[PDB]
Every structure is written in structure tokens, then in C-alpha cells.
Amino acid sequence: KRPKISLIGSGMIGGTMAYLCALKELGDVVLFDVVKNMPQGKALDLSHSTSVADTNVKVTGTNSYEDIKGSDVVIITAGLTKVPGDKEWSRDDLLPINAKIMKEVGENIKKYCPNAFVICITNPLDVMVKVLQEASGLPHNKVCGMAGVLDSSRFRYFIAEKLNVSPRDVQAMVIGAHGDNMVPLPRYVTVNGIPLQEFIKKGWITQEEIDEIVERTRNAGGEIVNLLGTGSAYFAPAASAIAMAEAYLKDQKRVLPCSCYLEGQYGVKDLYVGVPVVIGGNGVEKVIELELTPEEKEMFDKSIEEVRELVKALEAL
Amino acid sequence: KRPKISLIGSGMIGGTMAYLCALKELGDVVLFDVVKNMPQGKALDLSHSTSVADTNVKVTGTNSYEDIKGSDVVIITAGLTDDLLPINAKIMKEVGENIKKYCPNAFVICITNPLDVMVKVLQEASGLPHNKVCGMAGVLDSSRFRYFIAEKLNVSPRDVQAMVIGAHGDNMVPLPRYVTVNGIPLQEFIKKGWITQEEIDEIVERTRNAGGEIVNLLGTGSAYFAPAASAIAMAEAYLKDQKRVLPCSCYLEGQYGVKDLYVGVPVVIGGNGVEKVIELELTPEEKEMFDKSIEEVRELVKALEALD
Amino acid sequence: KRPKISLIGSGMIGGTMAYLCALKELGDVVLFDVVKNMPQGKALDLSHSTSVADTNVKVTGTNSYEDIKGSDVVIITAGLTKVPGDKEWSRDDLLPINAKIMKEVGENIKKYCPNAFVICITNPLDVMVKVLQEASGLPHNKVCGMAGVLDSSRFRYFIAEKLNVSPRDVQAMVIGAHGDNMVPLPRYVTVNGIPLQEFIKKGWITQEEIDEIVERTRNAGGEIVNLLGTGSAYFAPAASAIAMAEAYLKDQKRVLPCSCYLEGQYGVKDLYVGVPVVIGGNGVEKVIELELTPEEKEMFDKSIEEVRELVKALEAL
Amino acid sequence: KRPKISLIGSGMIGGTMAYLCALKELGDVVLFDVVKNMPQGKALDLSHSTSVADTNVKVTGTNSYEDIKGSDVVIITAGLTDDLLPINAKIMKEVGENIKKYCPNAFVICITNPLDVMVKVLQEASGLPHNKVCGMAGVLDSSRFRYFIAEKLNVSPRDVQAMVIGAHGDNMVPLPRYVTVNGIPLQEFIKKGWITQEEIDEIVERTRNAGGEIVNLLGTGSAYFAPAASAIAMAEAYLKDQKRVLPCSCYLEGQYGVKDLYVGVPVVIGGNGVEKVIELELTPEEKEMFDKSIEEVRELVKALEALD
């Protein structure tokens, strides 16, 4: 039988992700949402598009978790977003309400598709993937969060733009927690293996512009929201998560910064945070421990501790 | 120079089309919209997504018509969804004007409704060759027809040929007589038990109403995934000179009994636009449905010319 | 684990098929041949190409059947070709020698990958697929021959060329035995569902040109050989067979003329011959019984009987 | 008009390249060869294969140079594998002449060996801009280097960056110092136990010799799958203006200490050909290997100019 991909949450990101799954014939799709008839509407739109693409993909809409039975992969966008930010929204609403949805999603995964590879997108990302892992009981290797691939896609793009080379040939990474305490890694940026500093010396780019690109990367999500007025980014967020899903389903063994369960690496135990990892047919297969400078480890430590604060505040109740 | 694709209108359809242009590396994408900043917001999102796809596509958003200069393809969703007819026409008039000033060699694909009517306003206002302007509707209506037939037979939509002609709307005309499975007449599958004559009739009316069917289930807005894909397939056919056979709203000069009118019929789309009109051997009944389908189009086109 | 595709025979067709499998990331490939080191050379060439395509595909060369263990799909080009044609080659060499290789291939499939979907290309095609089925003991649904997709690709192309429309939008089919007694179906040719006769009346094509295209289709293989001097077609033959393999592995349910096991359909029992079929995740899933004219059934009967003659001559010894 | 890709030489590499052009719908393909009928035979085979891929690509074979008129890209494999140097040069002279007559705006990618030497003969004989002529070698040598490194680490080749510069041959110069895993220096993976310093050295010499390694195993002929893919990736970079960073044999005017010579170095390939040369910060040892690598090229280029 085909691979089964279930999208928990059928908003903008969920629909586009399902569009990519249909365009790439990655497998049968299931769009789930609490809103009645809505996932069923997109599914029929998307079903019609398969006709234009000359594919066979089955896309289904549903308001019941039962239809995620046997899913090979599960990708979760459901919950409140950051669009309101009201400075008390993250603390009084985002964190406490989303944690409760993650617990309900995790329980449904546990009963209906406990073998799936599970990719979380809901924010606060690092916190929510932990909660989803706890509630679902699945191996820590098969539950991770999408954040670094998106933050890296922005980083790489901004670099590629100034240098005027294809983004394929810009290697860039962003680690740490997803959010304002993310850590772009300017030292590790290369152009097809060439350190970026070589282009600084040859005048393709300058050091300040690089520092600007670091900050623009950290705020890229808000830059787009502000410009949209209504809504948030969904084209790149959806591709990033489907890159990770394609890496799992085709055992591509790609190297991508993802939010994953550490156990000693980087001096972190029993915690989810963004790090470079190898994604393969068996999920998160290897964590790469980068030889970070002391300064870099400091930014990583301050970012890893904000994640703790919130994991603990959530554990209060 | 890369091909340049300008999307006049950056709503749901326009943005979805821009994404397909970026995934398929069809060319540089310009997202135009009257709304301030919003196109630029989507453009940056889309730009980011090129890193994930490892492409080099340039996607820019703008609020100034000047940025469509030199466009090889223009795709128009600008409009709204009882003042809608004349307001959409002033828009379509304005869009068509900027096209002639800025990119008078573009292949233009109108999407806004009433499609077949607004197509002719656009051509008149832009003064472009009649074969370089057309409307996307038949590809989408056929993809629904094709899809519904495919799922009942349990074969791939690729091997279902099905077409829809006439005007885009509730009176569109699916053609069950021409449906085939890899060229095998659909009727052969009635006789061998794959589908019944009643289910075909039911499917034919579900195709007529699919637009509203989707609208009722979404609750806010209308379909756009298949709409976007249909427009891009038409643009891909022009950019790569694929000579595809597709139902599109095109300028007829006597074919089917229509003069100086844009109406949905099968055409060959290639590097020089709408390169050939296919004139089907329609039966009297089928020709009758076609005539009643376009009646509304011929009236509206006359009424709008009066209001100039 | 990835899907495993084994190519029995690593000649021109076998290598190209493996190139397509690598380009399309359809799965892990195994190139097998009796020639020592040769399949291993192509595999390393192809391995290098995956670097240019930015894929992860594992391509392996081998001279041992043991390495086809667990194959999801098996595609067989091995044996003598038609390139010599010496009028006694088909009878004294092609048929008797290839049948013996098919029996050895079938036995190796039976012991090492009895769950595979098996696509035969060796000629005489309809005869050899039967022999391979007998020797391997696998379900008749999971063993078929590639012939009609190639003969149809030629038919469709010749039509598309004269009309000057994309071949995608020309539906054309060829049924019967692969070879000189193949049956192009001019009546069933459509342009996106439109009968071809409509274009005859409107002057895009004429009836004689159509009849020429029927004959050119029947001789297309020899036309190319003659022009090549050395060798035979391998680009289209390889794609055709990989289309059938992609249809199985992705459960695409495509409609394609293939050589398959009939049991009453078309008044043929216990025999392999080319007919329109639906290929899906479970192999050959449905045979389509076309409402052929009496004339058409006559050409089909004369083509189905030449296949018998050879199946019986082979059964002598 | 579709892009026009002419392949001067229809052997194994040339035909494999034509197939990739047809699969990727990059443009119309012209297969030229001196051998009578053989190109036409492959063209018809390839044409048939377009039906299976559902593309509209035109593939023609010919024995007359006139059919390359207007080519946007030309890719040259014409040659043979102790008279081979001067015979290949008369050929490369002849090919370059017909190019200037027939398609003097083409992007030209030479493949025949000794690559870096025959590249300069071609440019001289064709009189084309030095940025519109280059040679494919570094992409292939890097794809082997990249591949060997990828399989030992068990990561995707996509996330291995590795380069090879200098001349194409046994003296080519892999650059283990610049190898990275998604930008992470390869040395970090020594320290954490993924690969050893000895296996890198071994890999670096296996890259040098991969060409012959393949040749020994095939028994007849040489590699062509990766060779073809590398040339097409370079042509795709030109046709779609992808601005790819790739090691190619390109005209240097003082970079690296080379004047009026074609040598393998990293470049940016885009819509205007070889748009930029990247000048790496090579160490003394690395610069030394580079100089010894091109010594043979500078001598042969001088010796062949004398024989005119």
C-alpha cells in the first residue's frame, strides 16, 4: 500500500503541505481539522488538481482522528499562532492552550498510528514537540520538530541574494530554539564548501551585511507577518516540513537542523532543541555535535535555557 | 533572460500560482496587487521556499504596474467575489491598458469571472493579438470532470480524457460523449460494468456545480489549488511550446457559429499562443447546449460595450 | 527500507533503466549480468551520477543472483536479441536459448525474491514471459511482459508528429503479440478523447498516412536497427518498462497495453499476450476487454496463434 | 522558440545527454555525428521515449553541420579514444569553425580529452567570447569525490560539498581541505569518528583514478552516465540562469597565475556563460599541486599553436 501522510491542522500551511505531497506523489494524504467541512473542501480542490498534474494521489478531508489510522507520517500545524503580538499572548494563551492540544494529538497518535514519524510545527516549537512526545509514548527518534530547516532556508536565501549565487550552493545553518533566541551560525556558512570569509576578503559581501542577515534571519517571521497584515508565512514553512518528511520516507539521509531529543550532546539531557541531524528511513538517525566556539556555546546555552523555563512553567499545571 | 511571469492579483490563486512557478523554475515571478505590502510579504515567503527547493527563482512583490515591463506571460486574478460586473470591467479595462503600455508581447491568461466576458474586455482594452489572449476555465472544469470519472473507475486521472466547453459557470457543457479511458470510449465501460449510465449523468451535473460545491464546504473563499494548476499548465504550454490540447476560452471567428467572442473550446496552445482551434463534430443536442451556454456571454459583452 | 529493483541483464537497456531509477529516486538498484566486473563498472558510473542529481540512490553491480534477495521489482533484459536477422536465428537460437535462460532466471527469482513484481523484456516476449512464469511459480498477476507500452509509444509518437500536438494528448494502443504480428488499433486512437477520424475530416491527417503509421509502427524496431548498424533501440524500451515499474511501486493504476495472463478474456485461456490492463500496487489488477470489430478480432486471433505455435515448439523439448 | 541544444558527437555520452535533455524538456536536441545514419537511429529511439515521458521534445539526428544553426548550447564529444592529440585538434579546429559560421552566440561546452587543451583550440578556432566557451571536467571529478565521501559517512551526496581543480587527468587536484558536510568542515568528522585521515587520503587518490577505475571494470569504452549528467547540469545552469557554483575548465586572465589558458577552477555559470571566476585562498602546497597539474596543459597548448 501507498505511504499515508496525515496533516493535523488544515490551515494555510496544512493545505500547502498537502499540495506538495500531491505534486510530488509522496503518498496518500489525510487533511484533518476541527472545522467542519473545511478539510473536505480543500481535499476536493486538491483532488481536482491531481487531474492537472496527471497523478493518482488520494487526498482526503476529515474531522475525525480515526482516519489517521496507520499513517506513515504525521505533521501537526494545529493550534494558536504568533500572529497576535498583545505581549501576554505567548504566556497566557499560546503556551498553555497549545500544550493541551498537543496532549490530545499525542494521545490520538498513540492509539491510531504509533509507528508514524511525527513532525511538529506548532509553537513554541521545541516545547510543543516535547509535550507531544510525552503524551504519545513513541520513540524519541521518531518525533521531532520543524524549525531549523525554515530558519536555515531564510538564512541561506539572504546570503544567496547578496552574493548572487543559487541558494543550492549556499550552506547555512541555524540551531537552538525556534524563535527570537535562535542561533544563526555565520562561521559555518559556506559557498559549496568555501568558507564565507573568503568572499568577505574578495568583496562579494561584508561583515556588517552578514551581521544584518543574522538579525534579519531571527526576525524573518515577523517581517513577513507585518507586511501581510493578516496571517503568517506558509509557503516556506510547509516546504521545510515536507523536506523532512521526504527525507524520512525515501531514506535520503539528509543533513538538516531539526528540533530533536538530546541525551548528553551539547551538554543537554532529556530535552528537545534544534541541532544538525541526519534524517533517514528510521527517523532521526544521528545527531551531529558541532565544535562550537565558547561564544557560540554561550548563545546556545542561553537559548537552551529559555526552552527549559517554558517546559517547567508548562509542567507546573 | 529568464522568462518573466507577472501575476496581476496576489490573492489565494495568484500566490498559489507563484509557488508553482517557483517549484517548476518556469521563470521570474512578479506578484502585483493593489493591496499595499501584502504581495511583498508573500514574495519573501516564496523566496525563502526556493532555498528548500534548491532553485534560483526570483520572486518579487509590488504595488506598481511598472514592474510588469517585458513580461512573457501575464495571469490575472484581479477582481472581487450586484456591482461586481461593472466594477470588474473597469479593473479589467485598467489592467489591459497597463499591459499594452508595458508588455505588449505577453501571453495573457485572464482568470477573473465572469471569465469569458472579462476575457474580451481585456483584449479590447489591451489591443493585443487575439491569439495572445485567452481565459482559463475549460482546463479546470475538465480536471473535475476527469477526476470524478477517474475515482469511480479506479484508474489514474492521467488515462481519463474528458472535456468541458461553453461558458464558465453553471451552464458550462461537459461532453460525456467524448470521454475516453486511454482512448477507449467510456460507453464500453458501462457495458462491462465499471460505471452506470446514471452515475455518468450524476457526474456531469456534479462537474457543472463543483465550483459551488467547493465554495459551500470551505465556508470562506473559493477553490484555488486546481484553479492555479490549470492556469500554470496553460502558461507552461506557452513557455515550453508544448502544443497541448486544452479547453480554454478563446477568440472565435466563425468556428461553432461564434464571431468576435471568447468562448471555451478545445485549442492547441504553443509558443505562439492559441495556435489552433479544434472544431468538434458536435451533435445537434450538444451544439444546442453550447449555444444556450454562451447566450449569457454574448448579451453581457454587448451590454458592456454600450457602457463606454 | 527502500524499494529494491533488480535488473537481470546490464546491457544498454539495463543500464539506462537503472539510470532512470536513479534519476527518479524510485529505489535501490541492483545491476546483474554474467559478464565479470561490467555491472560493477556501470554501477559506479551511475553512483557518481547520483552526486550530480543530488539524490541518495544506492546502485550496485553484481554477478551473483544472491544479491537480488528481497527485490520488490525485477526487470529482465538478459539473452539473445533480434539484431541478427540470418533467417534461422529466431528459430534455432533466439527461441530455444532464451527459453533456457528464462528458466534459470525464474528459478532464481523463486528462491530469492518470490514476492517481486516481474517485468520481462527478452524476446520472443509473450513466449518468454510465459516460460518465466512457469519456472518461477509466482502468481500470474505479478508476472507480465513489456511490449505494448513501447509499441504504443511509437504509434503515439508517429501520430503526434504528423498532427503537431504533444504526444501526451495522443491516446494510441497496440495489442497482440510483440513482433511483426502486433496489432495497432487505429480505430481507438484519440486526441484527448476526440476520435482521430475528426481530424481526417478536418484535414490534419489522411487515411493512407494513418495506414503507413500502422506499418511503420510494426517495423519501428527494424527501422532503428538498420540505421544504427550495430545494436538496437534502448532509450524507449527502457522507459516503457520503467513506466510499468513506476505504476506498480506507486500504485498509480495506469492503463497500459502489457503482455499478461489471460483466462477467457478475448477467447484466450492459459496464455500471455498483449492487452490493455490496469497496473497497480498489486500488479496486473484488471484486464480490459475491448469491444473489437470482427476484423480486429481476426488480426488478434492470427497474432495469438503465432504465440501458440512457439509456446508449443518450445514445449517439445 | 524553444532552446536549441546541439550535441557534436552522438556516441555514448552524446546520446545519454540527449536523453536527459528530452526527460528535462530543456529544448530541442540535435544529435550530430560524422557516422552516417547512426545519429538518426538514436534520435528516433529518443523521440519514441518522449511519448513515455509525455513530453513534446524534438530530437533530430544529422550528419550535416548546417543543422546546428541558431543553437543556444553546443556540447562536443567528437574525438577518439599516439596520433590522438593532433587528430583530435584538427577535429576540434573543424568543429569550432562550423560553430562560428552557424551559431556564433552559443554557449559551448567541450568534453573531448585532453579536455583543458582541446578547450582552448576550440575557442581559438571558433573566435567566440572566452566566457561563452568552457569545458566539463570539474563537475564530474567533484561528483566522484563527493560520492566517495558521501558513502563512507552515510549521508546524502547532496550535503557533501567537495571540489576538484586543475587539469582533467591523473594529475587533477582534489581539495580535501575544502570538503564540507552542509558546511561543516570534514575534519570535524575525523575527530568524532565518522572517517579517518587515512580514508580521506585514499579517497583523494581514488578520485584521481576513478576514470581509469571505471575503464578497467567496463572492459570496453569508458564512463558516460556521470559525464553526461555533469555536462547537462552545466547547460541547465546556462539555460535557466541558475548561477551555479561549479568547477569547470575556464579562461583565466591572471587568476591563480594563469594567462590565456583554460583550466579547471570554480566558477559561477549563469545566463551569460562563465559569469565569475572564484579565486580560492589556496595554501602554498595546494597552489603547488595546481601549478604542476596545469604544466602539461601549458606545454601542449604551446606545441599545438606551433603546428599551424
Ligand SMILES: NC(=O)[C@@H]1C=CCN([C@@H]2O[C@H](COP(=O)(O)OP(=O)(O)OC[C@H]3O[C@@H](n4cnc5c(N)ncnc54)[C@H](O)[C@@H]3O)[C@@H](O)[C@H]2O)C1
Ligand atoms: N475562471 C476560473 O475558473 C477561476 C476559478 C476560481 C476563481 N477565479 C476568479 O478570480 C478571482 C479568484 O482569485 P482569488 O481566490 O485569489 O480571490 P482573492 O480575493 O483572494 O484575490 C483577488 C485579488 O485581486 C487583487 N486585486 C489586484 N488588483 C486589483 C484591482 N486592480 N482592483 C481590485 N482588486 C485587485 C485584490 O487586492 C485582491 O487581493 C475571482 O475574481 C474569481 O472569480 C476564477
Ligand SMILES: NC(=O)[C@@H]1C=CCN([C@@H]2O[C@H](COP(=O)(O)OP(=O)(O)OC[C@H]3O[C@@H](n4cnc5c(N)ncnc54)[C@H](O)[C@@H]3O)[C@@H](O)[C@H]2O)C1
Ligand atoms: N572531459 C570528461 O571528463 C569526459 C569524461 C569521459 C570521456 N570524455 C571524452 O569525449 C569522448 C567520450 O565520449 P563517448 O563515450 O561517447 O566516445 P564515443 O566513441 O562513443 O563517441 C565519439 C564520437 O565522436 C563522433 N564524432 C563526431 N564528429 C567527429 C569527427 N568530426 N571526427 C571524428 N569523430 C567524430 C564519432 O563518430 C564518434 O561517434 C572522448 O573523446 C573522451 O575523451 C570526456
